[PDB]
């Protein structure tokens, strides 16, 4: 009976709320109150990557920390050599409305998708010498919002149709579908071990998924608006989400609740991207306001600002060795900061 | 050799310059409308599980790419942001005196959106023949859904479009005034609304868009060539 099930849902919600409030014996802020402040950290633009005709929507670092792919909505991916600013590759896309791109951890493939509802895999190591579309994964009924490689053969995607998916690239069909979100899934982050991944999905909730079983381990709430960005903490036991309510928020999987919130009264614009430094002490968040902010993830005070983009900061990413952070903006530039 | 890599980068950049020329000289339009609007027929008259459709046509040797969302959910507040750089939004609305208020709200949201706040809207008050028939029949009254229409009278400067009843003229100009009031309520001038009374049969539609794009681009040139 519908009303009976509603009562049961409310009772279970209250039970979960009480269970997670009982564990809130302290706060991250209180426990970190005695830790030495990070101080004001200043980052300078070491490189500016020019060549995209339109706004950049996504970028991803290679695992070697030197090559990085960026997607722009002129319908083009560019593989840059960040050390020299050389354009290693330029891949024209069939659909110009790309909203995400990914770099395979082996470096053999890139992935990209968008309003076409398709995730195209491009092979970077063709014997012909040219980059080719190895596969194009169809089956999402909404625009492709994010995609991350688990492996040369497995890719996890999210879409505006409210579902995530795990694909078998060789067969090109959905090995698993992850359902439970009620809004557009705006981002996903893969855990370091690639056994779990979190997703933020335009319903003010983040969800933790186990790829092998294929269902939601946990649901985290506390954001007041759509979540645009989500990133896993380096040790994999926590993650950070940025939302349209102009705040970042750090959740802990084991405590199953919010641990911290990064917000300042002068910031009244949405957050487009988030990332952690290698140690996890710095949380770098890009904003609809044209500059990124670097937060002390332990004390949640603004440790610095990356200003220098003339438009919306759309994408943000730290290298695997932590040497630099790339920020790509709607002004069609990527800037490497150090 | 690093020099060979730099030479490859330079060749990539040359190709990118060619693509930049082609990209700059082509005009991109976003076609929006509800189910009842005849935007599909407008697309079908522009000739010469996918989430987006492109129709590329040409007028006086200038190329237009018009994009219409396909398989998407009705929550548009995220993918609409992808179109903050198009030259115009062709917003098609059915004159069905009732979905008119829903269309007005759609137009208002498109108009006041932060990322679409500099995009001009070409407004097609589509299906004018149906509006004329519905007004002449007299069975449905606009006052039921827009009581302010009880006080409305056609402005003197309004074009008569001869052969047209005063009643249908009053109705159509009130409907146009609703959208124009929404568009002028902003008080910024960053972008303009270009209303048109159209029917999907209209062969003039393409030309209309062209004549509107000429204006929109002109407004950009005024700023790009230091004339304002």
């Amino acid at each position, epitope marked *: 009976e519908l009303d009976q099930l509603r009562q049961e849902a409310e009772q279970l919600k209250n039970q979960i709320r009480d269970a997670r409030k009982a564990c809130a014996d302290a706060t991250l802020s209180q426990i970190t109150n005695n830790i030495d402040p990070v101080g004001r950290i200043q980052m300078r633009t070491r490189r500016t990557l020019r060549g995209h005709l339109a706004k950049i929507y996504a970028m991803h670092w290679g695992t070697d920390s030197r*090559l990085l792919v960026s997607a722009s909505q002129d319908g083009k991916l560019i593989i840059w050599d960040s050390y*020299t600013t*050389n354009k290693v590759h330029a891949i024209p896309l069939r659909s110009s409305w790309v909203m995400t791109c990914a770099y395979a951890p082996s470096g053999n493939y890139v992935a990209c998708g968008g309003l076409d509802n398709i995730c195209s895999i491009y092979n970077l190591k063709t014997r012909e*010498g*040219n980059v080719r579309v190895s596969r194009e994964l169809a089956g999402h009924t909404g625009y492709l919002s994010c995609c991350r490689f688990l492996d040369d053969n497995q890719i996890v995607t999210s879409s505006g149709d409210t579902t995530c998916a795990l694909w078998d690239i060789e067969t090109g069909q959905q090995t698993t579908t992850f359902t439970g979100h009620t809004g557009d899934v705006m981002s996903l982050s893969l855990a370091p071990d690639t056994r779990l991944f979190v997703s933020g999905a335009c319903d003010a909730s983040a969800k933790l998924w186990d790829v092998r079983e294929g269902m939601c381990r946990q649901t985290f709430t506390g954001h007041e608006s759509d979540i645009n960005a989500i990133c896993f903490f380096p040790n994999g036991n926590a993650f950070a989400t940025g939302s349209d309510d102009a705040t970042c928020r750090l959740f802990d999987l084991r405590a199953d609740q919010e641990l911290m919130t990064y917000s300042h009264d002068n910031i009244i614009c949405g957050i487009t991207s988030v990332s952690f430094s290698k140690s996890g002490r710095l949380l770098l968040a890009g904003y609809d306001d044209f500059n990124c902010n670097v937060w002390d993830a332990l004390k949640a005070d603004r440790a610095g600002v990356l200003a220098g983009h003339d438009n919306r900061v759309s994408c943000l990413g730290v290298t695997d060795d932590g040497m630099a952070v790339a920020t790509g903006s709607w002004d069609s530039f990527l800037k490497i900061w150090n | *050799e*690093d020099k060979a*890599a730099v*030479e*490859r980068s330079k060749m990539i950049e040359k190709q990118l310059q060619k693509d930049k020329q082609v990209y700059r000289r082509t005009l991109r339009l976003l076609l929006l409308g509800a189910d009842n609007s005849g935007k599909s027929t407008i697309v079908k008259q522009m000739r010469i599980t996918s989430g987006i459709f492109e129709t590329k046509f040409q007028v006086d040797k200038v190329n237009f790419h018009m994009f219409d969302v396909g398989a998407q959910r009705d929550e548009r507040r995220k993918w609409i942001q992808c179109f903050n750089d198009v030259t115009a939004i062709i917003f098609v609305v059915d004159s069905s005196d009732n979905r008119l208020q829903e269309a007005l709200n759609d137009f208002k949201s498109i108009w006041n959106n932060r990322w679409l706040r500099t995009i001009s809207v070409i407004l097609f008050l589509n299906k004018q023949d149906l509006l004329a028939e519905k007004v002449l029949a007299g069975k449905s009254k606009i006052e039921d859904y827009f009581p302010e229409f009880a006080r409305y009278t056609t402005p003197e400067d309004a074009t008569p479009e001869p052969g047209e009843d005063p009643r249908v003229t009053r109705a159509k100009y009130f409907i146009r005034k609703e959208f124009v009031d929404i568009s002028t309520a902003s008080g910024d001038g960053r972008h303009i609304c270009y209303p048109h009374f159209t029917c999907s049969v209209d062969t003039e539609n393409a030309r209309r868009i062209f004549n509107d794009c000429k204006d929109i681009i002109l407004q950009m040139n005024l700023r790009e060539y230091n004339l304002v």
Partner: single-chain antibody
Amino acid sequence: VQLVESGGGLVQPGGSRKLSCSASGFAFSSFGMHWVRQAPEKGLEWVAYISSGSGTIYYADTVKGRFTISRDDPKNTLFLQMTSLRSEDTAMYYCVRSIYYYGSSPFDFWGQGTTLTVSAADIVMTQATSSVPVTPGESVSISCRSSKSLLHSNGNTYLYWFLQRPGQSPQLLIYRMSNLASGVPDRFSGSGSGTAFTLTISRLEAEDVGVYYCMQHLEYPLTFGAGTKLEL
């Protein structure tokens, strides 16, 4: 991928000729191309190079001013005009594709070669031994030395190991002194110290016999070694 050369044969000294090469099965326009000769009974020697886009052209000093390298990308062809041919110009000429970008492997594919007969400051690369007796299943090492240090300031060590089997064109084994080429078994390994280099084959398999050649891509004139012969 295929590279087929033609235009060889016998020619009188002081004459002129046109070697041609048709490329198929790969994006010819995006690959730089080299001409590399091999004397009837001696080692490899680089002849000429034309970059992708034809923006850069290099010739070996021994042939500079006499040979002219050109390419027709729409026809997927590479041409080498030769004039004032001397006696030393008799050799089998190989066309070798090579693509340059971060992490690429140049000199990866070699043509079948066309034979040409003529009627009757550089970095010197030296391989320790011309010959070494081997038997299947054993472990063998090949040594190489260079006048200059092939280690560059950017960290790359520009040494390449090629293997030429009897009757076959050379195939890339190692590029940049430590990277295995596509399709090369794990048996082969490359290492070195900038000025001296070693290629080790573990549990030598049949068909690994042949001449191993060293090459340096550090500076404009590409130079090969004398070659080291492995036979059963």
